Design a protein around this ligand. Structure first.
Ligand code: O38
Length: 258
């Protein structure tokens, strides 16, 4: 019931998450202030597995200054046996908040979208394509969405192919536009309450449906024609035809108060 990171002492309240290797806690320091500590167990991981967490920490360090839509890493400790990461605790992950809500406020959704774009745009500017974008990768802090990780690490639950882009599937026999596809489905989930291919349970049929142009994604008419425009442009199978994040940011949907 106690963790020491770079001198400071933190007391474990509860546990938020657990990977095979790692664990996430809600903690309090000496001043009763709330934080989140990612503890990773390095006993024992391959030379390759080690570098993944090293890379994730390095990039999470280098990017603190460039955006506040990246989660805040206050301090960290790393030995040969463990890693501890003192981060923002926030309120709740986007994945869980989506389930515990039935209908989503349009004004909230637009501000959440604008936040994700900013965050993903940032990592792109430093040559980082998140290879596995999902709601669970975003943290709500004061109603502000923040990116938690960069997909370089090994992912964590409190395993879906819904957010997977066609080019990744066609690759079996990286582009920044992949994150644009995954973000599309997250906003699609915020717009129509489900992901574009959620209901197809057969996995060899779902993946075939994603890549297949003959399969057509249904877009019901919403009172926000722009939101519609975004949804269609993001869900284009051809990454050259697909909209870019700098384009997405000049889009009326995010720029026009209506
Ligand atoms: C159903 N539920 C999930 C949460 C929750 C979830 C996450 C966080 N905060 C953080 C803060 C940092 C990380 C990291 N790294 C992280 N990761 C979780 C781990 C499990 C998978 C989802 C992301 N979560 C705070 C959360 O709220 C507790 C607080 N404060 C609350 N209810």
């Amino acid at each position: 019931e106690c963790i020491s990171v770079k001198g400071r002492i933190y007391s474990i309240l509860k546990q938020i998450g657990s990977g095979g290797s790692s664990k996430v806690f809600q903690v309090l320091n000496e001043k009763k202030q709330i934080y989140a500590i990612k503890y990773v167990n390095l006993e024992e991981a391959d030379n390759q597995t080690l570098d993944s967490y090293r890379n994730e920490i390095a990039y999470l360090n280098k990017l603190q200054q460039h955006s506040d839509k990246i989660i805040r890493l206050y301090d960290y400790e790393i030995t040969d046996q463990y890693i501890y990461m003192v981060m923002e605790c926030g309120n709740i992950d986007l994945n869980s908040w989506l389930k515990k809500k039935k209908s989503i406020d349009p004004w909230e959704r637009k501000s959440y979208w604008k936040n994700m774009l900013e965050a993903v745009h940032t990592i792109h500017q430093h040559g980082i394509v998140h290879s596995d974008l999902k709601p669970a990768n975003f943290l709500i802090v004061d109603g502000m969405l923040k990116l938690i990780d960069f997909g370089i690490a090994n992912q964590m639950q409190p395993g879906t192919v819904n957010y997977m882009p066609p080019e990744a599937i066609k690759d079996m026999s990286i582009s920044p536009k992949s994150d644009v596809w995954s973000l599309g489905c997250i906003l699609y989930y915020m717009t129509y309450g489900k992901t574009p291919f959620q209901q197809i349970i057969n996995q060899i049929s779902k993946l075939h449906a994603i890549i297949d142009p003959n399969h057509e994604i249904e877009f019901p008419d919403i009172p926000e024609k722009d939101l519609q425009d975004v949804l269609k442009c993001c869900l284009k199978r051809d990454p050259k035809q697909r909209i870019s994040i700098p384009e997405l940011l000049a889009h009326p949907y995010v720029q026009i108060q209506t």
